[PDB]
Symmetry: C2
């Protein structure tokens, strides 16, 4: 289950009408590494294997796909990861990013396929989404109530070999510091948003070399760094 | 200094075009309590006294405005609070104030909040949160993070600068922590331009707080306790 039907009263100057609404589900999950609870988050309860891997990578517990042995999801509120908010040491030298470059012409298809991938946003207006594009195709697309979680789910995909870092990432969320940082650390070279960057977001993209695209629309984009990757 | 000019490159199928943009400032601050750093946050660096106090309330350290003695703000990234991320004791309610909002003032409240600062229209990168009572906008705060904008409002109430006997409006979604914070300080009417989550709505139901979503000048969707709308 990802949403619940709920009644509201719409009030206007003329009067009051009852109405049916879709309301997105937000729910706490604990994240455990090798049977020890590392943390906890409010999540949209979908794609939680991916969420688990990506959250631990974001916190700095895991660095490579290869360390992950298995991940179990319990509907009681636990994701258990088995392996062999940002830390201070993450903010401060970036390894090289992938060589993917984005044909400007596929931008309309990337954005269309992303926005059309799930009906939850049109229904609930309470979820962000994040996807990866390579080879003229939307490889994966995750939503969550929190934009940082949706990105974590994208990272978890890469870490579980379900997607490649040789990709463009699009998000409906703002490209603040933590959002860019996650993408840069896993090696994604093109980071795109429907909306704005922060100054720290921008400054991380400049340090890493990453292409950062804002205000993305099907046939218009504002590139703030490395516009060479847009073909 | 709340934004910065940055060169952008606008690209269309027709061609290309340089441009200047204005980008909201996001910068880290440590919050200390009686000289121990309790935590750190990325903020918009305005109304930081309010932020320090409301951050510590939201975290469960401060319970009353009376506990607060002094707050020192160091513009190189520390707010130091002197007093005598969601907690679990907060989530699992004392009475709320008895303000009720006249429907006709809703347009005034939204217009005023939305016209209060140019940062949103400049940068598209900040959330706002305001309080309304006595036919006027008593305070309005902005931040890069919706949770922080609310923390600032909490901070004003706690600093004697605003009343909990008010309706609150935010541009952010009414997810769990947003509702929890406002209900914990006693605010009876909690409104957003946008949507609630299920846990946000659960908390409103438990506290008895009026929860209003998809708020427009002349149309609101009330999900709990519509009687407080006059």
């Amino acid at each position: 289950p990802l949403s619940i039907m709920q009644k509201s009263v719409v009030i206007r100057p003329g009067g009051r009408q009852e109405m049916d609404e879709h309301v997105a589900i937000e729910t706490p999950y604990a994240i455990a590494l090798n049977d020890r609870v590392i943390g906890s988050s409010m999540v949209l309860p979908v794609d939680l294997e991916e969420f688990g891997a990506g959250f631990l990578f974001g916190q700095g517990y895991i660095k490579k796909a290869e360390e992950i042995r298995e991940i179990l999801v319990c509907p009681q509120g636990r994701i258990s990861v088995y392996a062999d908010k940002i830390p201070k040491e993450m903010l401060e030298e970036f390894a090289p990013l992938a060589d993917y470059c984005l044909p400007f012409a596929e931008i309309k298809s990337f954005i269309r396929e992303a926005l059309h991938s799930s009906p939850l946003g049109p229904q609930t207006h309470c979820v962000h989404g994040c996807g990866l594009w390579n080879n003229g195709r939307l490889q994966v697309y995750h939503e969550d109530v929190g934009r940082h979680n949706a990105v974590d789910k994208v990272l978890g995909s890469i870490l579980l070999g379900r997607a490649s870092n040789n990709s463009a990432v699009y998000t409906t969320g703002r490209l603040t510091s933590d959002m860019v940082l996650k993408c840069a650390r896993i090696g994604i070279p093109i980071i795109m948003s429907r909306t704005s960057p922060s100054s720290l977001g921008l400054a991380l993209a400049k340090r890493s070399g990453a292409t950062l695209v804002a205000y993305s629309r099907p046939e218009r984009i504002n590139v703030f760094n490395a516009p060479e990757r847009i073909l």
